[PDB]
Amino acid sequence: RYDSLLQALGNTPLVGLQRLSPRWDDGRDGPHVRLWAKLEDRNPTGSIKDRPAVRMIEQAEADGLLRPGATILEPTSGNTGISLAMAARLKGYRLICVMPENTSVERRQLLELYGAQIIFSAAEGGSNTAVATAKELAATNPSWVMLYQYGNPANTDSHYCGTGPELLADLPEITHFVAGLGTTGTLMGTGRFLREHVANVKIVAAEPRYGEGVYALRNMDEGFVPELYDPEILTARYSVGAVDAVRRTRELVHTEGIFAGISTGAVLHAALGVGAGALAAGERADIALVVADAGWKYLSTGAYAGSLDDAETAL
Amino acid sequence: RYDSLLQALGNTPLVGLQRLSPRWDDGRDGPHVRLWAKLEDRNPTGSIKDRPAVRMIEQAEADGLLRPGATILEPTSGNTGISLAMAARLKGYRLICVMPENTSVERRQLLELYGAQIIFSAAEGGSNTAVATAKELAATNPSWVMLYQYGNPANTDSHYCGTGPELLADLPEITHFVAGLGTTGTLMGTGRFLREHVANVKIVAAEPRYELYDPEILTARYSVGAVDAVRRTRELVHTEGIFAGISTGAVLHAALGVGAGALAAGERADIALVVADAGWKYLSTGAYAGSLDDAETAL
Numbered sequence: 001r002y003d004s005l006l007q008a009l010g011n012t013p014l015v016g017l018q019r020l021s022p023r024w025d026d027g028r029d030g031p032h033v034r035l036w037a038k039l040e041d042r043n044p045t046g047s048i049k050d051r052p053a054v055r056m057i058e059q060a061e062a063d064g065l066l067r068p069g070a071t072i073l074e075p076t077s078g079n080t081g082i083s084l085a086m087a088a089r090l091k092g093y094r095l096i097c098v099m100p101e102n103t104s105v106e107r108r109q110l111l112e113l114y115g116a117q118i119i120f121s122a123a124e125g126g127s128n129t130a131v132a133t134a135k136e137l138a139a140t141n142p143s144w145v146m147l148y149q150y151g152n153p154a155n156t157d158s159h160y161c162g163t164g165p166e167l168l169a170d171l172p173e174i175t176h177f178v179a180g181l182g183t184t185g186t187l188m189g190t191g192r193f194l195r196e197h198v199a200n201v202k203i204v205a206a207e208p209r210y211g212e213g214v215y216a217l218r219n220m221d222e223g224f225v226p227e228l229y230d231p232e233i234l235t236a237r238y239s240v241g242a243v244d245a246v247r248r249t250r251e252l253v254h255t256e257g258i259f260a261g262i263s264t265g266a267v268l269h270a271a272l273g274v275g276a277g278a279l280a281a282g283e284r285a286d287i288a289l290v291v292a293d294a295g296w297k298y299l300s301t302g303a304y305a306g307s308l309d310d311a312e313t314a315l
Numbered sequence: 316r317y318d319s320l321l322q323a324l325g326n327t328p329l330v331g332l333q334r335l336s337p338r339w340d341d342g343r344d345g346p347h348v349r350l351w352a353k354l355e356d357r358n359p360t361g362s363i364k365d366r367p368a369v370r371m372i373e374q375a376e377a378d379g380l381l382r383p384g385a386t387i388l389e390p391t392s393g394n395t396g397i398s399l400a401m402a403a404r405l406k407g408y409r410l411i412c413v414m415p416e417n418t419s420v421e422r423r424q425l426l427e428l429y430g431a432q433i434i435f436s437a438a439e440g441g442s443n444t445a446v447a448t449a450k451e452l453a454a455t456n457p458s459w460v461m462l463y464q465y466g467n468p469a470n471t472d473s474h475y476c477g478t479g480p481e482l483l484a485d486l487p488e489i490t491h492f493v494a495g496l497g498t499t500g501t502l503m504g505t506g507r508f509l510r511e512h513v514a515n516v517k518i519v520a521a522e523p524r525y526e527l528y529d530p531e532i533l534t535a536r537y538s539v540g541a542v543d544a545v546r547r548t549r550e551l552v553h554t555e556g557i558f559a560g561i562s563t564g565a566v567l568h569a570a571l572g573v574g575a576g577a578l579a580a581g582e583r584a585d586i587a588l589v590v591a592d593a594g595w596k597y598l599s600t601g602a603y604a605g606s607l608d609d610a611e612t613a614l
C-alpha cells in the first residue's frame with residue numbers, strides 16, 4: 001500500500017532465465033551457468049530511471065536547493081525526462097527538458113503528456129550544447145535548478161542504496177552483474193556496492209558500438225564521458241552491435257516472455273558472452289543482468305517486426 | 316527471487332491518488348473520499364490478464380485437459396492473447412492464436428513476438444468465426460485445447476484468490492471496488508471475495524455505452540462514453556503521472572461519480588479502482604492529446 005506513486009518503485013523482481021541460460025542445472029558436464037533478469041520496468045514510469053529521478057529530487061530537497069513551485073531543468077530526453085516529469089508533477093515542481101533539435105521523436109513522445117516543457121538546442125552542438133544550455137538557463141532564476149544526472153552522485157546513490165542491496169539479498173551467490181553504460185549510474189552505484197560486499201564479483205558493461213547511431217536508444221554523443229564514470233569500477237566493457245542487440249531483444253521475449261527495450265538486448269548479448277566463457281571454463285556463474293525498460297516505447301522503430309536488416313537501418 | 320516469470324505475477328501496488336481524489340484528508344468539511352489505483356500493468360505482460368491466463372492453464376492441468384506436449388488454442392488477439400502466449404510458453408506448451416485475417420498488424424506482430432503461432436480465419440465472420448474455427452481445430456486432437464476465458468471459472472477464481480486478498484490486505488477500510496466489465500472475471504471474482512469479507516462493500520462496474528456474470532454481485536453499474544473515458548485517461552497521466560489504458564479512464568469516470576456522490580452525502584469513502592493496462596497500445600490513436608472529438612472518432 002502506497003500513499004504516493006513515488007514510493008511504488010524499486011524492490012524489483014529478479015527472474016531466472018531457465019531456457020536462455022547457458023546451463024540452468026548443475027550436472028555431469030559441469031556447474032550451472034545462470035542468467036537472472038532484474039525487471040526495472042516494474043517501476044512508476046516503466047524504467048530504471050525512476051530510481052535516480054526520485055533520489056536526485058529528494059536530495060536536492062534535503063540540500064535546500066529546491067523551493068515550492070521550482071522548475072527543474074535537465075539536459076535529457078527519454079526515460080529520465082519521463083521519470084522526472086512524473087516525480088516533479090507529484091511534488092509540485094515544473095520540468096523543462098533541454099535536448100538537441102534533431103533528437104529522435106520516440107525519445108520525446110510522452111514528455112508533454114506527463115507535463116514537461118521542451119527546449120530544443122542546436123543540432124550541430126549536440127550533447128555538449130544541450131548541457132551548457134540547461135546550465136545557462138538554470139542561472140536565470142533562483143527558482144530554476146539543474147540536477148545533471150551525468151554528474152549528480154544521487155544518481156549513483158540510488159543504485160548503491162537500492163539496486164545493489166536488492167541484488168545481494170536476492171542473489172548472494174552472484175558472480176557477475178551486467179548492465180548498460182549510459183549515465184553510468186547503474187554500473188557505478190550497483191558495482192561499487194557489490195564490489196564492497198561480494199567476494200570476487202565481476203561488473204560488466206554493455207554499450208553501443210562506436211560508429212553506430214542507434215539514435216532512438218542514445219541520450220548522448222559517442223565521445224561524451226559522464227563525470228559519474230569511474231573506469232576502475234568495471235571488470236570489462238563490451239560494445240554490442242545493433243543487429244545483435246535487436247536479435248537478443250527478440251530472443252528474450254520469444255524465449256522467456258520478457259518484453260524489453262533494446263538496451264536490454266545489448267545487455268543480454270554481453271551476459272551470454274560472459275556466460276559462454278564460464279561454461280567453456282567449467283566454472284559456476286550466476287549472472288544478474290538489468291532489464292532497464294520494456295519494449296513498448298520502441299515498437300514504432302519497426303525493430304520488433306520485420307527483418308533484422310530493416311531494424312538495423314531503422315535504428 | 317523467482318525461478319520463473321510466472322511467479323512474478325500479482326502482488327501489484329495499490330497507490331493513493333492524492334490529487335485526483337475528491338478529498339484526501341478528513342476535513343472540517345467532512346471525512347475523506349479517497350481514490351486508490353491498483354496497478355495491474357505491473358504484471359509480466361503489462362496487463363491484468365496475466366492472472367486469469369495463468370490460473371486457466373493451471374486449472375486446465377488439474378482438470379486433465381493439458382498434459383505434456385499439449386497445444387493451447389485461443390481465439391482472441393488482445394491482452395488475453397498476449398498473457399496466454401507468455402504463460403503457455405513458459406509452462407512448456409505451444410500456443411496457437413486463431414484470428415480474423417484483418418486483425419491489425421500491431422496486434423499480430425505482438426503475438427508473434429511472444430512466440431504465438433498464428434492461424435487466420437476469414438475477416439467476414441470476425442471473432443465469432445475465429446471462435447468457431449478454434450473449436451473445430453481443437454476437436455481434431457486430444458492434445459489440442461481451447462480455454463474459454465469468457466466462460467471459464469478459473470478466470471473468476473484468479474481474482475477471488477489474487478486480486479481480492481491483495482486488495483483487502485492493502486485496504487481493509489475499503490468501501491467500494493470499481494473496475495471494467497468485460498469477461499466479468501475481475502468484478503465477479505474480486506467482488507464476491509470482498510462481499511464475503513467486508514460488510515457493506517460496494518462493487519461497481521464501468522462499461523461502454525450500449526458467461527461468468529452473476530447478477531447478484533454488482534451494486535452499481537456505469538455506462539461511459541468515449542469522450543469521458545478519454546478525458547479521464549488524460550487527467551490521470553497529467554495529474555497523477557500514471558499512464559493508463561482507455562478502460563482505466565472509464566473506470567475512473569465511474570469512480571469519480573461514486574466519489575462525488577459520497578462527498579455530497581458526507582460519507583467516508585475508500586474507493587479502489589483497477590488500472591488494467593498501460594497507455595502504450597492506445598497511443599497511436601492520438602487519444603492522449605489534441606481534439607477530444609478526434610479521439611472519439613479514432614475510437
Ligand SMILES: O=C(Nc1cccc(-c2ccccc2)c1)Nc1ccc(O)c(C(=O)O)c1
Nearest residue numbers: 078079080180181182207208219245263266
Ligand atoms: O544508455 C543508454 N542506452 C544504451 C545502453 C547500453 C547499450 C545500448 C545499446 C542499444 C542498441 C544497440 C547496442 C547497444 C544502449 N541510454 C540512455 C542513457 C542515458 C539516459 O538518460 C537514457 C534515458 O534517459 O532514456 C538512456
Ligand SMILES: O=C(Nc1cccc(-c2ccccc2)c1)Nc1ccc(O)c(C(=O)O)c1
Nearest residue numbers: 393394395495496497521522523544562565
Ligand atoms: O472490457 C474491456 N475494456 C473495457 C471495459 C470497460 C469499459 C471500457 C470502455 C472503454 C472506452 C470507453 C468506454 C468504456 C472498456 N477490455 C477487454 C475485455 C476482454 C478482453 O478479453 C480484453 C482483452 O483481452 O484485451 C479486453
Ligand SMILES: *Cc1c(COP(=O)(O)O)cnc(C)c1O
Nearest residue numbers: 079180182183184185186263292
Ligand atoms: C539509463 C538507461 C541505461 C543506462 O543506465 P545508466 O544507469 O544511465 O548507465 C540503459 N538502458 C536504458 C533503457 C536506460 O534508460
Ligand SMILES: *Cc1c(COP(=O)(O)O)cnc(C)c1O
Nearest residue numbers: 394495497498499500501562591
Ligand atoms: C480484461 C480487461 C478489462 C475487463 O476485465 P474483465 O476481468 O475481463 O471484466 C478491462 N480493461 C482491460 C485493459 C482488459 O484487458
Ligand code: NA
Nearest residue numbers: 453456457459
Ligand atoms: Na482436443
